[PDB]
Write a protein that binds this ligand. Structure first.
Ligand SMILES: O=c1cc(O)n([C@@H]2O[C@H](COP(=O)(O)O)[C@@H](O)[C@H]2O)c(=O)[nH]1
Ligand SMILES: O=c1cc(O)n([C@@H]2O[C@H](COP(=O)(O)O)[C@@H](O)[C@H]2O)c(=O)[nH]1
Lengths: 231, 231
């Protein structure tokens, strides 16, 4: 077990490149998050390796399918032994409930089930291209509510909602926030940003730091940095 | 190369169970579609096996992330060599365009890039739980349009839209339709259904048959059946 609310997004296009970074750090420092890129490349096999080293993995595949598929997928993750698994709230109540149930069979060994609300890389200007008149914060909340109702453990959103949410949903409903840029840090496709500091402020349970840590010379260092920074 | 517009959804929770079915059939008969369930279990390794046997694989992971992730993911698929790859239209223009571009580097060897519009397992009653006042067919079309604009090759929808679409988008914009129940066939979580026949009618380019073929004694048979049926 670690204490940092930090989950580092391992988004490398090379296994070694990534395993390099991993060896430099240690569980106690943070949790790891494998996602679409790295999973499409090394499958659950790579997840076993990261687990062999003791870390808690967050399989970030944001399942968004028909109820049947969702549930099967979630359980395949529950089989991998992962710490936490992803699902898209935009996929509907039926689907979410389906996922939840698929986990009862694993009970206490079930990973944490969380649903992605609105992606941090979006602004009302993007939701507009879709028949969306609402707004990031607004919309994300509706999804979050539906996610609550279905019995999921938490939701995924920008730290810029971690207050209105933590508010309306309580310290129970866990919040995981990505799009964490620590000042004078390139944003990129990221939008609803915030820094480690102000993030920990809103009350976020965990935060996902991607490039800031991985696209910085001597990343191991930047991690220790960001940690202390959060104390 | 095969001729059937059929892609069988390989959604088995066991590698052998699945490889059994596969050996019974042959490329010429249909194309295979690996998705969340089976991929979360056997990774791209299993995709190589299906390809080793000569079939065309459709990696159905419905990527729905931040633009950066999407593009990286898509390319990881382009590396696997898959025939066709998935992406969620609900993920926005920026994201889609990001994916498209990530493929230019592979040129002629690039898999087909298609975006999922509205999942076949949904009805206006489900879209309602979200701030959606529109309707299946309606909404799916908006997404499809945005997908067209971004330069993607096709879209994924119910065969019950393959006409208004094939209409508004032309024989160019490829259509792939799942939720195919051949009369007196259990629907399940499926909703906007249609039969192989009426599907081929609307003009769908490819169709995804899941359980009808896999949850039927002697499936190999049911495939040959459904094929002839479509002639
Ligand atoms: O809303 C979300 C949900 C995510 O999972 N993510 C993920 O967080 C990761 C890290 O992004 P970054 O390098 O910009 O910190 C990526 O894997 C991305 O897909 C995100 O950026 N926004
Ligand atoms: O809109 C969609 C998109 C899909 O990929 N699918 C997929 O098609 C597959 C087969 O479903 P079925 O067994 O009901 O024919 C599943 O892998 C499912 O996720 C779907 O059912 N509806």
């Amino acid at each position: 077990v670690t204490n940092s609310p930090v989950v580092v997004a391992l988004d490398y296009h090379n296994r070694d490149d990534a395993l390099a970074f991993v060896d430099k750090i240690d569980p106690r420092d943070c949790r790891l998050k494998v996602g679409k890129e790295m999973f499409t490349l090394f499958g659950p096999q790579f997840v076993r390796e990261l687990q062999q080293r003791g870390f808690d993995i967050f399989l970030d595949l944001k399942f968004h399918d028909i109820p049947n598929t969702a549930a099967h997928a979630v359980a395949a993750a529950a089989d991998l032994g992962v710490w936490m698994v992803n699902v898209h709230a935009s996929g509907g109540a039926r689907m979410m409930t389906a996922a939840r149930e698929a986990l009862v069979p694993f009970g206490k060994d079930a990973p944490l089930l969380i649903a992605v609300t609105v992606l941090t890389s979006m602004e009302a200007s993007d939701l507009v291209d879709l028949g969306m008149t609402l707004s990031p914060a607004d919309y994300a909340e509706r999804l979050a509510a539906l996610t609550q109702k279905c019995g999921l453990d938490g939701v995924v959103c920008s730290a810029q909602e971690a207050v209105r949410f933590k508010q309306v949903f309580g310290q129970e409903f866990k919040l995981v926030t990505p799009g964490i840029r620590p000042q004078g840090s390139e944003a990129g496709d990221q939008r609803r940003i915030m820094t480690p500091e102000q993030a920990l402020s809103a009350g976020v349970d965990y935060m996902v730091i991607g490039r800031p840590v991985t696209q910085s010379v001597d990343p191991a260092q930047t991690l220790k940095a960001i940690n202390a920074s959060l104390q």
